[PDB]
Ligand binder design. Structure first.
Ligand SMILES: Nc1ncnc2c1ncn2[C@@H]1O[C@H](COP(=O)(O)OP(=O)(O)O)[C@@H](O)[C@H]1O
Ligand SMILES: [Zn+2]
Ligand SMILES: [Zn+2]
Length: 294
């Protein structure tokens, strides 16, 4: 089921749709980040479809006005949109064609509504820079941009420089009791574990393909299938199952790149940081060790 999303959740989902559809056209990716959605750019049609489904705007045959209303209500004290305009676009979007559910059908009505209320959707869905940043400042429990998911989780459970923490940095795993909470936080933050507590196999494979690995899909599937996990330590156990299946070297190569990208989800969509560079990763991992005082 869908529920209101915080600015980190929307930014995560937006970046995932952009990566899946931009097709190495960075100028088109730049337009999407600015929400310059124009039917006339080839790939934009199916990108909008990805975006509205991921944001809970589109479900069955047409849009869901009560989802958009729920998203507006969840952050009305911060989105800067009047109650009149809020309920307006919810109903205004829920009067769309849709019906069949094609890319060009949903994108046409979305681009049409977006241009009639420019900037309002970015505010309601917490992608507007001022709305996003104010929410982050008032909600320290949400991971903001500029800090990695592992560092954000690590600061909750470990003292900087403590031995168990530096083992996590060095080997990606720890036997100490705090690692159950930490790996639950990071596996969920990486979306390897979904909100409902179940593993997302495709999300793990995204991390492998990001570092240009290709033959290990059926290896990950077996690790998950044969894993004996108890609900008290569910994420930790699946995390260790993936660790053992891939081995430390490959597992950490995947995790290090996930960590670097988690500071700003648009990382791979800028051209200079669009390609995995194993040589550049060494100094990035070193800087993250230093940040943790390890
Ligand atoms: N919590 C977050 N964690 C990681 N990346 C985030 C988060 N929130 C937003 N982002 C990313 O931040 C990017 C914006 O970075 P930057 O362009 O320098 O900031 P701004 O919006 O001010 O331009 C967005 O495209 C989004 O992907
Ligand atoms: Zn090691
Ligand atoms: Zn096969």
């Amino acid at each position: 089921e869908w529920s209101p999303m915080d600015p980190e959740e929307v930014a995560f989902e937006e970046a995932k749709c952009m990566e899946d559809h931009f097709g190495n056209d960075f100028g088109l990716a730049e337009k999407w980040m600015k929400w310059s959605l124009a039917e006339s750019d080839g790939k934009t049609a199916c990108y909008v479809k990805c975006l509205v489904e991921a944001l809970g705007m589109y479900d069955k045959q047409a849009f869901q006005p009560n989802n958009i209303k729920q998203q507006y209500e969840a952050y009305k004290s911060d989105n800067g949109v009047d109650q009149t305009k809020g309920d307006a676009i919810a109903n205004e979007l829920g009067k769309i064609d849709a019906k069949d559910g094609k890319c060009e059908s949903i994108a046409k009505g979305f681009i049409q509504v977006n241009n009639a209320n420019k900037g309002v959707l970015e505010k309601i869905y917490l992608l507007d820079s001022s709305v996003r940043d104010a929410i982050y400042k008032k909600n320290p429990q949400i991971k903001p941009k500029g800090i990695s998911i592992f560092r954000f989780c690590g600061k909750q459970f470990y003292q900087d420089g403590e031995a168990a923490y530096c083992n996590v940095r060095k080997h990606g795993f720890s036997d100490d009791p705090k690692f159950i909470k930490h790996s639950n936080c990071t596996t969920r933050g990486m979306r390897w574990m979904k909100k409902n507590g179940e593993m997302d196999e495709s999300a793990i494979l995204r991390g492998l393909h990001a570092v240009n690995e290709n033959g290990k899909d059926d290896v990950v599937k077996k690790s998950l299938q044969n894993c004996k996990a108890k609900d008290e330590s569910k994420a930790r156990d699946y995390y260790k199952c993936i660790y053992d299946g891939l081995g430390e070297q490959l597992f950490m190569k995947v995790l290090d790149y996930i960590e670097v990208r988690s500071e700003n989800y648009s990382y791979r969509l800028r051209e200079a940081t669009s390609k995995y560079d194993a040589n550049a990763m060494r100094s990035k991992v070193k800087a993250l060790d230093s940040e943790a005082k390890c």
